[PDB]
């Protein structure tokens, strides 16, 4: 389609000279297989037609030479084809990765992390496998045809018109079928993918499908997918049923017209009898090329849907960019100044945050508290420009956050998000990640601070106990204490905890926070939590509900002043 071609002509552009070599070796390797029946015609005419027995062996020698040349440039063609087809695909997933890693949190979350993974490896692969196979196994159909025309023009240029009337009518009657087949075939593929979706959703929720007694509603929702799939797969196979019969009928009618219009010349003394043995093989090789080239065009529609995903990624332009002349203070020593900040996803009815306006001092700790989906994690991501404000301002020390180099900001902030992630390797590699040159008496110090030193010292390999890919070999309370620890080997100015203490009991939560505001007593801490016990000793607590700030104060002066806060602390029996 439009995006499969604009992608294929951009990323296979540096290998034009590896393609001009495959396209000159396929020509030689096809003209050398169209030349074996010519030397066979020479055997039939200078050999058989004479006595001349030696002329058959001393001309089958010329034929072994040609059949060796035909293979020394058919592996040389796949050698360069498999190099161009991997350079394309190297350069394509390099581009997809380099573009994805410029996205923001919103733009990366819009695609996902798995739909964004199977869009750079096994989705670049379906176009890599298209280039490979269209340069080594599909250009032979248009090369065998044109080369057969030139061979039929070399030998007996008078009966060559049969191959100028049979190749057009074969690439036209086979273009008609494919032009009517491509739509009914690309609809069948979005309809196989739907019936499977139905089965996946029925097997995943076979328990709630029954809790509601929806097996009548189901299997009427599946009987429409099954029957529609069969209706689109049965008309896609009535066009695919004309492909072989029509092409073989064209070749066979051309073959039976060959002997008539060629015997009319052989009687007239203007054609040798061996020139039929040659033309028949020209036709029967053009046939074998066209058949196996049209029987593997099913990869163009499946790799033009694949190239739509890659183009959708590559056409996404980021919106959060490091400004032109960013302000660069001597040291970002946190003082957060949310002024009238709102945030609304494009098209929504209600903004996530609306008219939020508060301020956390240089060496204090604020705590924002609210319900689910009330805008707490959206505020953390606004403080450190993972998201970008729409109608307000985020300031740190007095300078707008949109007016700072986004990389110096992140270097001053220690972030612990809700969806935390530990990277595979070593626990001393997951916290050699906030500092990158930490010693061991710093790693153990901050593992003590995060109350994580026990389960990492109680291990043979020391602070080298291997972590799985997602940090899955730990419990929640260990996985989110390593995440707090690697934010403590940074010594930031601004700590941003986003539900960082939810899988910890009140005891270890209080331990971690005591050890935190004892070694980082001069840093600005912002705690996002639904639990009130981790908010009791905050210097100020703000409550947000439906986006708006309902109340600001401390645990005591807000337990009476804010109805939502009192109702919130009453649901926990304080």
């Amino acid at each position: 389609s439009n995006m499969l071609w604009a992608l294929l002509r951009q990323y296979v552009r540096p290998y034009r000279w590896l393609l001009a070599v495959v396209a000159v070796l396929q020509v030689i390797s096809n003209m050398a297989s169209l030349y074996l029946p010519t030397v066979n015609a020479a055997i039939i005419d200078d050999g058989v037609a004479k006595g001349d027995t030696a002329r058959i062996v001393e001309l089958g020698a010329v034929m072994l030479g040609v059949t060796a040349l035909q293979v020394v440039c058919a592996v040389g063609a796949v050698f360069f084809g498999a190099r161009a087809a991997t350079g394309f695909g190297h350069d394509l997933r390099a581009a997809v990765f380099t573009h994805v890693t410029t996205f923001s949190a919103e733009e990366a979350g819009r695609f996902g992390a798995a739909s964004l993974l199977t869009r750079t490896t096994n989705d670049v692969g379906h176009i890599q496998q298209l280039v490979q196979l269209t340069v080594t196994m599909l250009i032979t159909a248009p090369i065998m045809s044109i080369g057969g025309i030139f061979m039929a023009l070399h030998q007996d240029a008078g009966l060559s018109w049969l191959l100028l009337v049979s190749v057009p009518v074969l690439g036209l009657a086979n273009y008609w079928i494919i032009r009517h087949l491509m739509p009914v075939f690309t609809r069948m593929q979005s309809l196989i993918d739907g019936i499977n979706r139905v089965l996946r959703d029925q097997l995943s929720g076979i328990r709630v499908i029954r809790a509601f007694a929806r097996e009548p509603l189901e299997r009427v929702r599946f009987a429409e997918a099954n029957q529609t799939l069969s209706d689109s797969a049965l008309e896609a196979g009535r066009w695919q049923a004309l492909m072989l019969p029509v092409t073989t009928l064209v070749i066979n009618v051309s073959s039976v017209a060959l002997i008539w219009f060629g015997g009319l010349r052989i009687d007239a003394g203007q054609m040798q009898v061996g020139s039929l043995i040659a033309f028949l093989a020209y036709f029967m090789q053009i046939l074998m090329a066209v058949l196996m080239a049209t029987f593997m065009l099913v990869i163009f529609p499946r790799a033009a849907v694949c190239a739509d995903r890659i183009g959708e990624v590559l056409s996404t332009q980021t919106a959060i960019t490091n400004p032109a002349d960013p302000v660069r203070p001597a040291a970002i020593a946190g003082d957060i100044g949310v002024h009238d900040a709102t945030f609304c996803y494009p098209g929504a009815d209600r903004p996530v945050l609306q008219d939020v306006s508060f301020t956390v001092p240089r060496g204090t700790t604020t705590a924002v508290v609210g319900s689910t989906g009330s805008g707490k994690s959206t505020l953390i991501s606004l403080i450190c420009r993972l998201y970008d404000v729409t109608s307000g301002s985020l300031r740190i020390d007095g300078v707008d956050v949109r007016d700072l180099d986004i990389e110096q900001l992140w270097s001053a902030i220690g972030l612990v998000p809700q969806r935390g992630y530990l990277f595979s390797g070593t626990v001393a590699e997951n916290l050699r990640y906030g500092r990158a040159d930490a010693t061991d008496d710093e790693m153990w110090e901050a593992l003590r601070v995060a109350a994580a030193a026990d389960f990492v010292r109680a291990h043979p390999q020391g602070l080298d106990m291997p972590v799985a890919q997602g940090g899955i070999n730990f419990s929640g309370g260990q996985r989110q204490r390593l995440a707090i620890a690697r934010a403590v080997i940074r010594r930031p100015a601004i700590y941003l905890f986003d539900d960082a203490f939810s899988a910890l009991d009140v005891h270890t939560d209080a331990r971690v926070r005591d050890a935190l505001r004892e070694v980082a007593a001069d840093a600005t801490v912002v705690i996002v939590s639904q639990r009130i016990s981790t908010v009791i000793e905050a210097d100020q607590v703000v409550v947000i509900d439906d986006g708006r700030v309902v109340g600001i104060g401390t645990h005591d002066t807000l337990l009476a002043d804010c109805p939502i806060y009192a109702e919130f602390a009453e649901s926990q029996a304080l």
Partner: protein, 616 residues
């Protein structure tokens, strides 16, 4: 695997039994299309041999006979041309006789015009009979899934039953139309095209069938010498896809902390290390076609030379070597596909017995027509003693009572058997040695369709199918107007976060931008169960990923201010369970202690020391 091959084969092959007319008219209609592509070159060689007879038979002196011409040729020192003339039905003086050429070519044309009709009609009748046994196979798998007990789905592996109804039914189709279409005809065009060229020359068909061994040996030498290249390219793309998976999943931790360059340079390594290892495996896997066509052209140089050395001696005719060359390209054409059209039939009949074992596994227990009636609703267990696997009790001598207008609240550790108790109330599993009565009638003598609909549950894990939020909520009661769906969407507090979505109530659950949280999928699931107006409502920790204050409002408005609804609330945060009349405290299968909040609190039991773990 594939514990049998005979029974599964004879059972799959008679799945093509309902329409045996279409299956018999595809086989005999393909036999008549093979007996013509074999007799076509042989008729066409007769036409090309009528030409050669008249061309090198009109230069001879007119008036002589075939014997005298051969004698004269021998006499004037032509040992080979005289043999040519001898093994050739000629007559000295006559021309081509285009009457015979015209009749032969008219037969060949009218018989090539029929073979392309018997193949079109075959491919059309083969597509009707295949896309008709699949619509009937894939449609009794569907009716099987709704008959199996829940003990079949959660005792299997994760993707096991999924990729047995969706990938094994795609391999049965690609094996039901591969072996009546591509390997029933490519065995006839190997037996017939071979018996036809044992009649032309048994010496030349020996130079052709000795490229089955040579072309099956080298397509087995290359694919075991490029085996250490598929295991340096599957584990070298599996490291790239593992780096990408963690640099995309921890993207706000790669982004923050500055490690964009350290993660982009590791990608530059893993990417120019899967290029080198994929080229090496895609070259050697690709030089198997240039190698099966070199051996195929060496058996063409051999035929063209020897059989052309054999026409010049008069042993065979020029028209029978043209036919034979047609057969050389028609014989070893279905010999560069035998690997595929046999491994597909192997793993198309292996994954055709999985499905048949799925279609033969025992169904559930043939329910009753009683149609449970619940007007008040008084649940009561009586010495329930369920166990999943024998010898390991999961519930032991349990007995509770509901009081129609109440809300009993089940708390306890993880593994106490709280969810299992809901699988017993919903009759997902059958109780062992004990009664379970809703409103008086044993639920074991009740149509499950009417029991499950007079109840309603929300489990801790949520199911949402591929659609909008509106559809996923209206799934609880489809015959409900837009207002009654938004009314249940408001009591479950999903109307709160749905106006902050770009297109609320139309935002697809399978195609959002991470817009729907994990606790918000639990709210959409609570709205789905309150839309059906259940009389018995069970909330099995379906409010565990949300605020503990949205939880106290949901299980206030839906459970405690509904005087006309009995409701179980299985909760982990037991601070929303207080002031909820009759807390039941379970442990290791049985109810240790019970009562209201104050009774159970001022008796110093397990509940007393559980209400004091979140408060020191």
């Amino acid at each position: 695997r594939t514990r049998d091959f005979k029974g599964s084969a004879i059972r799959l092959a008679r799945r093509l039994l309902p329409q045996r007319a279409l299956t018999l008219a595809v086989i005999l209609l393909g036999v008549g299309g093979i007996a013509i592509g074999v007799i076509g070159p042989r008729i066409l060689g007769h036409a090309t041999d009528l030409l050669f007879n008249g061309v090198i038979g009109r230069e001879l002196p007119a008036g002589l006979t075939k014997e005298q011409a051969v004698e004269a040729a021998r006499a004037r020192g032509d040992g080979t041309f005289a043999d040519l003339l001898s093994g050739m039905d000629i007559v000295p003086g006559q021309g081509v006789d285009f009457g015979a050429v015209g009749r032969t070519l008219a037969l060949a044309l009218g018989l090539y015009l029929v073979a392309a009709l018997l193949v079109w009609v075959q491919a059309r009748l083969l597509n009707v009979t295949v896309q008709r046994t699949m619509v009937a196979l894939r449609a009794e798998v569907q009716e099987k899934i709704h008959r199996l007990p829940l003990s079949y789905f959660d005792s299997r592996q994760r993707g096991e039953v999924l990729s047995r109804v969706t990938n094994d039914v795609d391999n049965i189709q690609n094996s039901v139309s591969m072996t009546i279409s591509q390997l029933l005809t490519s065995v006839l065009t190997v037996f017939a095209v071979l018996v036809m060229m044992l009649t032309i020359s048994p010496l030349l068909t020996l130079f052709t069938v000795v490229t089955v061994p040579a072309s099956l040996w080298v397509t087995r030498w290359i694919t075991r010498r490029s085996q250490p290249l598929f295991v340096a390219q599957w584990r070298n793309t599996g490291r790239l896809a593992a780096h990408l998976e963690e640099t995309y999943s921890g993207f706000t931790i790669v982004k923050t902390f500055g490690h964009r360059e350290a993660a982009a340079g590791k990608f530059a390594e893993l990417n120019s290390e899967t290029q080198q290892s994929s080229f090496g495996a895609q070259f050697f896997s690709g030089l198997v076609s240039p190698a099966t066509m070199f051996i195929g052209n060496l058996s063409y140089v051999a035929v063209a030379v020897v059989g052309g050395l054999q026409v010049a001696t008069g042993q065979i005719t020029l028209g029978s070597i043209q036919a034979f060359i047609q057969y050389v390209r028609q014989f070893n054409q279905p010999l560069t596909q035998v690997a595929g059209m046999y491994n597909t039939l192997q793993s198309g009949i292996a994954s055709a017995e999985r499905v048949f074992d799925l279609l033969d596994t025992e169904e559930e227990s043939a329910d009753s027509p009683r149609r449970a009636d619940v007007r008040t609703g008084r649940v009561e267990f009586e010495h329930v003693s369920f166990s999943y696997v024998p010898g390991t009790p999961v519930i032991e001598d349990l007995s509770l009572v509901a009081e129609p207008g109440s809300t009993v609240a089940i708390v306890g550790p993880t593994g106490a058997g709280k969810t299992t108790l809901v699988n017993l109330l919903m009759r997902f599993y059958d109780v062992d040695s004990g009664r379970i009565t809703i409103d008086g009638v044993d639920i074991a003598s009740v149509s499950r369709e009417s029991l499950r609909a007079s109840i309603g549950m929300v489990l801790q894990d949520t199911w949402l199918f591929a659609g909008t939020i509106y559809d996923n909520i209206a799934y609880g009661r489809p015959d409900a107007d837009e207002d009654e769906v938004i009314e249940a969407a408001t009591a479950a507090y999903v109307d709160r976060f749905v106006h902050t979505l770009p297109n609320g109530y139309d935002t697809r659950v399978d195609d959002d931008g991470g817009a729907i949280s994990a606790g918000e999928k639990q709210l959409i699931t609570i709205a789905r169960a309150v839309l059906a107006r259940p009389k018995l409502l069970v909330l099995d920790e379906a409010t565990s990923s949300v605020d503990t204050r949205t939880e106290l409002l949901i299980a206030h408005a839906m459970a405690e201010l509904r005087r006309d609804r009995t409701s179980f609330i299985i909760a982990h945060r037991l601070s929303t369970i207080r002031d909820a009349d009759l807390i039941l405290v379970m442990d290791s299968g049985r109810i240790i202690e019970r009562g209201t909040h104050e009774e159970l609190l001022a008796r110093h039991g397990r509940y007393w020391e559980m209400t004091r773990v979140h408060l020191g």
